[PDB]
Amino acid sequence: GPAVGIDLGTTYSCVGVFQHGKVEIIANDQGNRTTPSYVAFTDTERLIGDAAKNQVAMNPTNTVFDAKRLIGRRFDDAVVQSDMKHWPFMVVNDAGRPKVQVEYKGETKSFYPEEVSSMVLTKMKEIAEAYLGKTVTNAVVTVPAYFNDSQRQATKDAGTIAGLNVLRIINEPTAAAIAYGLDKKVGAERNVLIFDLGGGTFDVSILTIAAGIFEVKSTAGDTHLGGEDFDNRMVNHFIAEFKRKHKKDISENKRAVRRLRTACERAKRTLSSSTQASIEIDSLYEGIDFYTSITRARFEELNADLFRGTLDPVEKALRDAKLDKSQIHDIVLVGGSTRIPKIQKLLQDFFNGKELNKSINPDEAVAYGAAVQAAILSGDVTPLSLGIETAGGVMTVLIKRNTTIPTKQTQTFTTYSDNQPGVLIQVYEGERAMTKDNNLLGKFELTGIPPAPRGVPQIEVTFDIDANGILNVSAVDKSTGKENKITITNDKGRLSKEDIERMVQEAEKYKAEDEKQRDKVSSKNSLESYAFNMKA
Numbered sequence: 255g256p257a258v259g260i261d262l263g264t265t266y267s268c269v270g271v272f273q274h275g276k277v278e279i280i281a282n283d284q285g286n287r288t289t290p291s292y293v294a295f296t297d298t299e300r301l302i303g304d305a306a307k308n309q310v311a312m313n314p315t316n317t318v319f320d321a322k323r324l325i326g327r328r329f330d331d332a333v334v335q336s337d338m339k340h341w342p343f344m345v346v347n348d349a350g351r352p353k354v355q356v357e358y359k360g361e362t363k364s365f366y367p368e369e370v371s372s373m374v375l376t377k378m379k380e381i382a383e384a385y386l387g388k389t390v391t392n393a394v395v396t397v398p399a400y401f402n403d404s405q406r407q408a409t410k411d412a413g414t415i416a417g418l419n420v421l422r423i424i425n426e427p428t429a430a431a432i433a434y435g436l437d438k439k440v441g442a443e444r445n446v447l448i449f450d451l452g453g454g455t456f457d458v459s460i461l462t463i464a465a466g467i468f469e470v471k472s473t474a475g476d477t478h479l480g481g482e483d484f485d486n487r488m489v490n491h492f493i494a495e496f497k498r499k500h501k502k503d504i505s506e507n508k509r510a511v512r513r514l515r516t517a518c519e520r521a522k523r524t525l526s527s528s529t530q531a532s533i534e535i536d537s538l539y540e541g542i543d544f545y546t547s548i549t550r551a552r553f554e555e556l557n558a559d560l561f562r563g564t565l566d567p568v569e570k571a572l573r574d575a576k577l578d579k580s581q582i583h584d585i586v587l588v589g590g591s592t593r594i595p596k597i598q599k600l601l602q603d604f605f606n607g608k609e610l611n612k613s614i615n616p617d618e619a620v621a622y623g624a625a626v627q628a629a630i631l632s633g634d635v636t637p638l639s640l641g642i643e644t645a646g647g648v649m650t651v652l653i654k655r656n657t658t659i660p661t662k663q664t665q666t667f668t669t670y671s672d673n674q675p676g677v678l679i680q681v682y683e684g685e686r687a688m689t690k691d692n693n694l695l696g697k698f699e700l701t702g703i704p705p706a707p708r709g710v711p712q713i714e715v716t717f718d719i720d721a722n723g724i725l726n727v728s729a730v731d732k733s734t735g736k737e738n739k740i741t742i743t744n745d746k747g748r749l750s751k752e753d754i755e756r757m758v759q760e761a762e763k764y765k766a767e768d769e770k771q772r773d774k775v776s777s778k779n780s781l782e783s784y785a786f787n788m789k790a
């Protein structure tokens with residue numbers, strides 16, 4: 255039967271299926287299209303999803319949430335140590351691996367984060383099975399773009415424990431782009447910014463899409479920013495208002511604060527569609543009814559620093575991607591908090607009035623994209639960057655990937671050593687900083703360089719690609735006009751789309767190491783007479 259797409263979120267999970275030409279987001283047994291990523295252990299039973307979230311106040315020590323924060327991580331990781339302080343449940347160290355420790359049926363029990371996430375995935379699998387009336391095994395599960403191999407493998411393991419065959423682990427921003435069909439657009443490469451403010455995290459991702467291939471250029475954000483922060487600002491404001499009006503602090507009473515927080519959450523949602531919301535609480539504290547109102551402008555003022563602060567990760571991602579804001583072709587809004595009008599206005603104003611992609615429910619877009627990809631898995635531009643080896647085994651790119659063909663690019667190079675008699679032109683294809691990590695396509699030598707000090711000889715290297723995709727690489731000694739050249743054949747089927755994707759993924763995985771590495775060689779246009787990779 256059809257594979258499902260699952261957004262395994264920090265706070266909630268969402269499951270969708272592509273059937274009958276459309277994606278259907280599947281509601282749970284309580285009629286909810288999103289299910290809380292919560293697992294609760296009690297004296298008599300294990301609760302998953304809505305039931306677990308509903309009883310959290312009654313059973314805080316044994317209600318687990320935020321397993322995504324621990325997944326694929328070591329106990330001594332700084333993130334784990336800081337996060338544990340904010341959790342009611344215990345996290346224990348089992349041989350360097352974090353485990354949640356809870357009381358279940360009168361017995362102490364410990365679970366790895368992948369096991370807790372497997373329980374959430376089991377609920378999502380069961381919700382899909384109830385809707386489809388058939389067993390669901392195949393699934394595509396989404397993860398944040400910044401997740402490392404350990405976090406990705408642990409997420410896959412959670413699906414495997416749940417009995418799911420994880421066809422692929424895909425980035426949440428990529429899933430959102432697939433939901434908007436941004437990978438179906440034939441033509442020149444497009445730069446896409448995904449603004450994801452929901453699920454307790456703020457994620458900004460910049461992607462480039464061409465020929466159905468996605469590359470993550472940059473990621474930025476705040477792992478501890480979400481709607482709860484906006485609700486807290488309202489709760490503190492109301493606590494102050496009650497204290498000023500009634501000379502009473504309701505902070506001591508946990509239920510009164512809980513009732514106020516629930517009213518604030520509802521009011522914030524009303525403020526997305528209306529300019530004012532009513533707060534009506536009977537007997538909030540000491541028998542005093544709290545009936546009041548909040549304007550959208552007051553809500554915006556209470557959260558002004560948080561809302562404006564969202565632009566700082568957008569600026570950082572643009573800087574990391576080496577792109578101006580004008581170079582973004584598509585902006586996608588993901589996450590429930592993107593419904594807030596002030597956030598939409600701030601982002602649109604930053605982008606000079608550019609329209610935002612927000613037609614898909616922001617809570618369901620990632621699952622929607624995952625479902626589209628799962629169905630695909632169930633049934634001219636350059637593919638890779640082209641360049642030559644410079645001194646130190648460095649990849650110097652003459653043609654970036656996603657360059658339309660035919661194309662011709664020329665750069666000038668020099669000798670690295672004094673009285674260097676010749677240069678070796680080594681042609682490589684790939685996105686890595688060092689040639690050892692890229693693919694060698696061919697090599698040729700330009701000999702007879704007249705003796706000169708290093709940096710004086712000028713060698714012009716030209717990469718020419720025809721419409722058929724054939725690459726001709728030539729080098730000319732600008733002092734004599736002497737030349738040498740190689741023709742590199744483009745075998746049809748030499749590279750699969752998956753082969754290209756793997757090369758792009760490797761660049762994304764080693765981006766920090768490669769970006770730091772580029773700084774090491776001083777010249778960047780100097781050629782040696784030998785292959786660095788063959789040097790002992």
Ligand SMILES: Cc1n[nH]c(=O)[nH]c1=S
Nearest residue numbers: 522523526590591593594
């Ligand atoms: C403001 C807001 N936040 N989250 C959500 O799910 N909806 C809304 S309208």
Ligand SMILES: [K+]
Nearest residue numbers: 261262263396
């Ligand atoms: K996810």
Ligand SMILES: [K+]
Nearest residue numbers: 450452455457
């Ligand atoms: K997010």
